Every structure is written in C-alpha cells, then in structure tokens.
Amino acid sequence: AYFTGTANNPADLLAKVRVHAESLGWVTDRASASEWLCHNADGYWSFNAGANQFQMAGNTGFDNSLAWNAQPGNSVQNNPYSSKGPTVAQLSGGPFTRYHLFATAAYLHLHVEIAAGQFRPVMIGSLNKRGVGYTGGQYVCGSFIYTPGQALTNNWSSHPFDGYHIQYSNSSCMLRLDGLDGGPSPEWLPFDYTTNVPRRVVGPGRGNYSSQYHPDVGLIDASANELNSSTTTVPCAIYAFGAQQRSRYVGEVPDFGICNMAFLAPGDPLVVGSDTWRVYPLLQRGTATDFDSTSAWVGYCFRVV
Amino acid sequence: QIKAMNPAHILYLVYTGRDFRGLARTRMDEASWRAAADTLYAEGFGLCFEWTRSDSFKNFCETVKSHIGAEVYPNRQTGQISIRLLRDDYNVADLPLFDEDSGLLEITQEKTGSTSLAPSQLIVKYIDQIDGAQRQIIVNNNAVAASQGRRSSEEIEFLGVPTGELAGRVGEREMRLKTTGLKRYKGVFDRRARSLNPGQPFLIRSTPRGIPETVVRVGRIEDNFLGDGKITLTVVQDQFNLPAT
Amino acid sequence: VRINAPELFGGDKGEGGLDGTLDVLFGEEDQGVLPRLAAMLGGLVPAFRGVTTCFYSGLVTSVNPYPKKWEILRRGGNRLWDGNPWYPEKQFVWLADGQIKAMNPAHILYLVYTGRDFRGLARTRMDEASWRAAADTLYAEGFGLCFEWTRSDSFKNFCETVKSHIGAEVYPNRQTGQISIRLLRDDYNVADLPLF
C-alpha cells in the first residue's frame, strides 16, 4: 500500500518498484534491468530507464521482438503530434533522497525526492470510470524540467495533467480515449491546448497557474480555509475536446487530490475521518507568487491505506 | 542384522565393571538407570563402539553422553550416581516454579543470542556396522539458508551411530538445538532452589523483566549454605528433544 | 585423449602398460551428459555438473592383477570465478619459460572472499582500487604461488598463510566499510606521510 525507501541511482528504484509490483501480483510480460513490458487487467504499458530520466509509453498489444517504443498500438505513432515522441520524465543523476510509493491493483503512484526540496512525481493507472461507458481511461504522466538555474516552471515546461504548455517534441502526460469521433480504436490523446488539434485533453496539472485552463482552478486556490485552517481535497476533473471543440467530461484521477500548501509543511498530516491523506509538494517549497523558480504552493494529495 | 547394545548398559558396565574400573553396585540409583534403559530401548537407540584409544574414562563417557544426550552426576542428597535424559517427557504443572516472591533473588544474564549466524547445512558422518564403511547423511536448513547470503556448512562425526535413520534423528536434534536461538539465563536464587540437580527442568517468572513463564534446564550450580548464603544457578532454555522419526 | 603406452611397464615381457582412451568432463555451466558414460553405467546418470571428472577405458596392467597408483598434474584458476573472471589480464603469472602457470595471490584472496562456491560475498564490499593496485604490483614483481586445498580448515588459516607468503594485511576499512589490502613495501614518499 504505502512504501518508502532510498535509491542512489534510478535502476535501484526500478528494481524496488518492480519487486513491490510483483509481490502485489502485478503481471510483467517481460522484465529486464532497464526495460519493462508489464500489464494488468486494465491496460498495457512499457517503461525504459535512461541515465537520468524515464521513458514511458502506453501499449495495447505485446510483441517480444519489437523495441520498447514499437509495441502494437504504441502512443508514438498513434498520436496527433508530428514529432511522434513518447512520454518523458526528466530526473537527475546520483542520490535520490527518498522515494514514496503507493501501490494498488489498478494504479501505481510514485513521488521521488531526488534532493533536498526537489520532488519528481511519476503517475500511472486508469481513471475511475464512474459509471461512464468508454473504452480506455489509461493515463501515464511524467515530470519535465525546462532548464535548471533559470525559471523552472516556465511556460514551455510540461507537468502531469498539464492544461497549458509549449513544446513540440515531448509530452509530460497522456490519456487513452478509444473510438473518438469514429476514429480507429487505438488513440492516445496527449494533454495539449495550443496545438489546435481536433482531438485533445486537458487537466488541472499545473494547479493554479495564471493561464491554466480548468474551471476548478479557483477550487484549488481556495482549498485552504482561513477561518478554521481546514483543507479540502479537489478531485482532478479531466476534459476531452471533440472534433468541433465540444468538451466531454471523462473522469477523475482515483485516490488523488490537490490543495494549497500555504499553511501546511511538506508531509504534514491532516487526518479527515476514517481515511488518512498524505500531502507533498509538486516540485519545491516556495512562495505564493513564485511561479517561475518553483511550483508555488501547489500540493499533491494521496490517500494512504 | 545389527545387534546394537543399549548405551545405558555401556555406561553402567563402565561405572561398575570390575575389569574396567569396578565400583560397588550399591552406589548407583537403580530407578533412574532402569528408566533410562527402558526409554532408550523403546526409542530403539543403540550404538556400537570399539576401545583402542586407551584414553581416560571421562572422554569415552562424554562421547557416549553426547551421542545419547544425557547427564551423569553424583546426587548431592543420596550420594548415588544418577542419569537424566534430556527429553520433553515432563508435565508443566508438577515442575517447580520460581519467582521474585517465590524464591528468585536476581536474574542478570539473558544471552538472547542471534539467528542470522549459525549454519544452514549440517553434514553428519557415521559408520555402517554391516560393512564398516564410512557413510554420511545431510541435514538441511532451507529457511536459514535463504536468510544466509553466503552458504555455510559444518561436519560432525557420530561414528557411534550404526544406522542412517538414527544418525538422521540425532542430526535433526542437533540442528534443532543450534538454530532455534536458545536463551541462556544466569539467575540468583534463595534456599528455595536447594533441591535442584543438574539437568532438572523448572519454571521461572519475573514480571518486571517481561519474561513470561519459561521452561529452563539447570546447568552449572554454585551454592553457599554457610556464610554469604548465595545460591546462584546457570540455566538454559529447554530445547532438547530426540525425535523418533 | 589418445593415451598410447601399451609397453610402459615392459609390455607382456614386463608388467604391462597404459593403453586406452581418456575422456575429461570439466563440469562447465552448460556441460551436457556424456552418452558413453551413462550407457556404460546405466541407471539415473546426472550430468556431473560443477566438478571436473574423467572417464578412462582401456588397459591398466598385465601379468599381475595389482594396478599401480597414479599421479596426475593439473593446472587451474580460469575455470573458477563461476562465470565472471575479475581482472583476467593479470590473473596468471608465467614462470620458467612458461612451464609453471602460477596464479596471482591477490586473485586467490579475492576469489576466497567473493567466490560463491567457497563462501560468497557481494563484490560491492571490496575496495576495487586497493586490490587492483596489489594485483598490479604482484604481477610486476612476478610473485606467483600454487596451493592445494585438502586441509578442510577455516578460511582464516588459509588467508593467514597467504598473507604471510605475500606479506600483506587484509582489514575491514573503518570509514568506508569495505575490505582493503595493503602491501608492506618501501613504496612511500617521506613528505606525504603524516607526522605526529
């Protein structure tokens, strides 16, 4: 359920998380020291560990003779992007202060502290269908940094579930929505807003950025109550745009929520009822208006069981 | 095929045999020796030996005791030689209990021990009396082997054992003892522990130390009836038992 | 191997000789079962993996039925290390025009400390720099040794014998925690050494 540890290199994180998944019963079609082709009852996925970053890509079929980025129905070729690039999660090289792993039968959530104040989230799973009849719902997200030293959260940067970004090569996170507007079933929709592609998805990823496109941004901003210092979680609603800019709500991120960290320190617990929640900063602790060098006060909330 | 002899008879002959040493038959507690012989015969635990070492009686007696797992001591009260077998043939209720308010003064040593160490594989070497050829059996410890990142093994020679099954039983007993993590206590008792003898099991309880009722077997004994009045005993946790299969 | 010595002991006029065919199974990781051995012996015949074995078939003696004791010379060191030799470029030392294929003592100690078959310890616990330097120095000095294991004694005794032969100390580094080896040689600079 809840796991913690340390990893000097990413490969150690690979080994530990794969060990946990196997112990939990997750089925790995193929395993290797650096390349993974695993799956579950919901969807197929593939991961590769680089020198200082992860490469993730969705999948629909299996073929052991194909490369990690050439599986049947792979996202690389079945995406509107002309670059045809898979999901990327940029990290650092060397010590990772600590990693926090949430494991279940339907999704995996990971939060790695590469260094003091630096956090890199890795998110994978399937959206809660919430009684909505649709094929897909698998989402894979990664963390990307534009440039160290300069503004870390520039406009060009991309974040999990991001609703606003500028980049032509790689996407931080993505989603599956099969048979959209009568198209072929294999469809891996990326989280983009400026490409004007007929089909796209959007999310509250950035939190409360100035040009974030989501109607709940106010809820995330007001998650904290001054009068009683109470904090409430906000489910992350995802929206998908049709061929003629007609949005259709798809679902919410299971066991996930966002809030403001104005009056909460990293890891501060607020047990609201029988179920406990863990809150951690997205990238680093900063000030309210530091939307360039850090992630401001946006905090990711996970349900711990 | 093999006409083995009861080890108790070997010890009795050595202690009372006119040819070997020769001691009066009146100095031996008949009841204890008869009970030991009956138990050994029921367990079908026989051994064969040959005398060519020309060593002291103590060495041969110690080898026999280690083979059978028994203690021979001169009874302090009656003065006769008594033999006690280390077997789980006791009733919990009848055994005496010792407590801080019931005759226990102070318990200092605990020797909780460790388990990450200790073998994972045991090799037992025995001789078959049918042909007199060296033979060996292997007693394995899979769990501790999994714990051990590096394999370990020891060799123990039980040339007195004439059959492989008996060697296996004694090897299982030895592995049981060596890898169960015994707790060795060094308690201090008042006069209430005056009648105890080596190998006699008894219970000890000490709530402040968090030690529940535990069964231990007496070891080294030092008592001072006149002067200091200090009776100090060294005991070990009861983990001695010879399986029949 | 075709061993041809039918008249080694004078043949028929003497005591016989050594004539036959010799087959050697070193026991590789992938060594297979020899059909001839299994067919001759029969029954449940394993592959005899992990141990060097030989199969001789032919004349042994004549005239008298009392065969003579044999003596076989064998060189080893490469088939050890399981499957990953360590610093093989300096594993062996050649002596006497290549007649004697001595092994570097540092390699012996490294195998004993990390050999899976003997004891087996993680290769990450050994300070690579110190051991590599010691091996390089020993190879440069041409200091090789040969040993045979039949004492069945503790690792400590064999390690102490090796250390006395080479004159080196093996200790667990207090700071980094790895096993370090230091050679007792006059290979130091006076200035850099600390003064008290």
Added chain:
Amino acid sequence: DTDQMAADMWAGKGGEHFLVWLNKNRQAVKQI
C-alpha cells in the same frame, strides 16, 4: 588494607571485569 579488599574482591565482583579484559586481549596473553 591490601588484605580484605585486594584479594577477597575476587569473590563475586572482580571476575566479570577480568573476563572482559581477557576477551579484550587474547593474542597478547594466550601465549606466555
């Protein structure tokens, strides 16, 4: 002075410290 406290101290107190000293120095005591 050096009679009851120097020698009789071995009764039950000076044994454990001597034993730990022995387990401390072994190679220097074991021979001669």
Added chain:
Amino acid sequence: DTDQMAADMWAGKGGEHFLVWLNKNRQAVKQI
C-alpha cells in the same frame, strides 16, 4: 589510589586468590 593498591597488590597477596578463582572457573576461562 588506583596506582599502588590496584596493581602492586599482585606482589604477594593477590596471587593465591586469583589461583583459587582459576581453579574454580576452568571451562568458562580455558578457551577465550
């Protein structure tokens, strides 16, 4: 204090008590 009475006591007094202690505990001292 712990100089003339703790060590020089071995001169001729603390030897007999140590010897009787040794003959008391043998198996526990003889090895290590």
Added chain:
Amino acid sequence: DTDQMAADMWAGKGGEHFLVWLNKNRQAVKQI
C-alpha cells in the same frame, strides 16, 4: 569502595601488572 576501584581498575591500568605477573609465574599457573 570495593566497587569502582576494585573491579573497574581493570579498565586500562591493572592489565600490564597482571601480564608481567603472568610472565613471572608460568609453571605454577599454566596448569590449574
């Protein structure tokens, strides 16, 4: 009195004198 100065003296002072006493008397101590 006979607690901190009689037993803890073995810490680092009473060892050398005991060792020299041992090297003094060997045949009388080596057995029993």
Added chain:
Amino acid sequence: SFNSRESSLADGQPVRLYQFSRGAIRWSYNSSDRDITYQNQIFRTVPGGITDNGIICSGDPQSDQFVITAPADLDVALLYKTRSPSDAIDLVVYDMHYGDAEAAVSWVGQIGDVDWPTVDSCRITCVSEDELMDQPGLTDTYCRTCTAIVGDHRCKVNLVPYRVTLTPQSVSAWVISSGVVAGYADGWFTGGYVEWQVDGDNYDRRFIEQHAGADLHILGGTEGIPAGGQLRVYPGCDGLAQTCDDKFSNLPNFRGFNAMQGKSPFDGDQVW
C-alpha cells in the same frame, strides 16, 4: 569542518550516532540529550543515554567486538527479547559534532549478541564481517545425496511456482494445521520453510520438521506465528536423484554422486 573541529583544541563537542537498518526499516539513536537531524534523518534521544566501550581493530574477530549500552526499553533490542529476527540488523556508526552538518563513518557491522543484564540497562555485542571467516570452507563431499539446499545457487531451481499462500486453520503449541496442504502426498512439504511478512519488506521464517496430512510440525514451536496472518510455504527436496528428477526434473543439475564409485580404488589388493 569535522576534521577541523577534531583538530580544534576548544571546539570539541563529540556526539556519536547509531543507525540500525534492516531492509526498509531503520532505527536511529543518538547519545546526546536532544535529537539530532542529519541527512534528513532525526535521531531519537533515549532517556538514560546510549554509550559504547570503544573500537578495537587488531585483526582478530574474536577480540575486536563492539559493545553498546542502552536502557531496558530500547526498541531495536526489544525484538531479540522473545526470538532473534531472522535477518541480520546491520549497524552503522557515525561521528559528528554539535552545530556541524558533517559526520564521519566509524564502525560498520551487524548485531552479534544482545542481553539485558539489568532491568534498567542493556549490553549489545556487535560483530564485524571478519568473524564470518572462522567457519570451515570445505563444503564438498562425495556422497550419494544432492549436497545442495533446494533453491540455492547450485540447484538452480525456481521455487516461485511452488509457492503456496494460505491462511492457517488452527495453530497449536507445536503444530500448525491447514486443510489446503491436506491435498498433497505425505512428506511433500518435508524440508521446506514457512515465510510470512512481519513488518515492511522483512519476513521471518521457520522450518517444517515433517508434513503429514493436514498437520505441519514446525521446528522450534509455533511461537511468534500470527493466528490469522498470511503465510507462504515452500516445499522441500529430499536430495535423492529419484526425488530430484521426478518432482523437480532438475537431474542435469543434480550435484550428488549416486553410483559412480563408493569404494573402488585402483591401488587395492584384489580387484576380484
């Protein structure tokens, strides 16, 4: 500044830190009167202090032990009170001075022995990796049995397919009974071991004297076995070639010598 403080004649503020680690669980203790934060790790202050006797490096494992003293209620040592944990508790010792964020590693090892001499104190004997070289190293015999632990690096047999997960039906003083194992032939589990999760990613394991029907005989008693906790049970290999091949089909890796030669010398007295 650690080295500079050590050389300093007036800033000496020694403080020794201990870190007991067992896989994914770490215990941190300090010898000062207040908690110390180091490398994002906070070391608890024991009410009564934790102190050692010194570090000796003379080349002899029997003599170069490390001794730790702590009160009776120490959490890490409390595990040994009933039964020693299966895995070894690695111990790492750091040295740092108050007011400085830098520390130096001094001693590394594992728990060797622990005892509670007094109701208010403890003594932990820590041993270094060097002591593990006193045991023999022969580990080779020309006998008929396998001479290998089922699943070891020599057998090369994967036990994961044979893993059985079950909830015990009834637990007694010496026997643990379950109906699921009743469906296997007698002696199927003989020689195997039972592994179950204690805390985090660490499992405590026990043995099986004998498997007969639905009853399993556990070596050393069933004390410490949860009555409802999930248990994983693996089989055991008798070691005979017939047993090795029929059950596991691992005859090619069979390390035993069944019928190669038991006595036959080539320098005897009479071949016939």
Added chain:
Amino acid sequence: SFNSRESSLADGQPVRLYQFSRGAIRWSYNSSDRDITYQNQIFRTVPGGITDNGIICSGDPQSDQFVITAPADLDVALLYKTRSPSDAIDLVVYDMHYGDAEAAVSWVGQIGDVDWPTVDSCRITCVSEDELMDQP
C-alpha cells in the same frame, strides 16, 4: 520441618555438620558453638569454628572441590601430619537447623588433600567420586 524452616523467612538457623568415617571409627564435628546431638551422635564443638567455602556441581572433578577450614589441632586431620592413612576417610555433610531433629545430606566424598597453612588454621580439600574417572 527442615524444608519448612528453609522456606521460613524468620526461623533461619543454619548449622552444618561434618561426619568423617573410616570403617568402624567415626569423627563428628559441628560449626556451631555448642554440641549437637543427632541420630544418637554428638558432634563436638571445635574451639575456633569449622567452616567451608561452598559446594560446586559443574560436572568437572578438577573444579568441583570442597574446602574445609579448621584449627591446627583437629584430630581427624592430625593423622595426615606424618603419613596419610592407607584407607580413605569418607566424609558426609549434613544440614540442620537448631531446635530441629531432622537433617538433610548435602555432600558426600572422601579426603583428597590436607595442609596446615597456618599454626592456627587448616585447609582440607575434599574430592568427590567423579574425579576417579580421569585415569586411563
């Protein structure tokens, strides 16, 4: 009442009796200040006291000795002054409490060695039957 007195927290009156026997001749001594009559046997009071060092039963004959201390004029030990008597002097030790007629046997053995360290004291080393097993 011997066991009851031993368990008693206020009636403890320990008294140790020694009986040295050699065939038809018996010597009786007591550690108290007045003679004790037990089993129709009167134990003499030595003017100066007789005391031991304790009983050890560890399984080693070399280490489990019994030591008796008595003055220089002890009659039983006086025989050893010139030459050791040919026969062994069996020794039996009883334990009893003053005012009670019941005693318990504690130690049984024979004289192993005797010496007169001081003109006012003696030390007798008594050995058990177990030591007789060290010879070939």
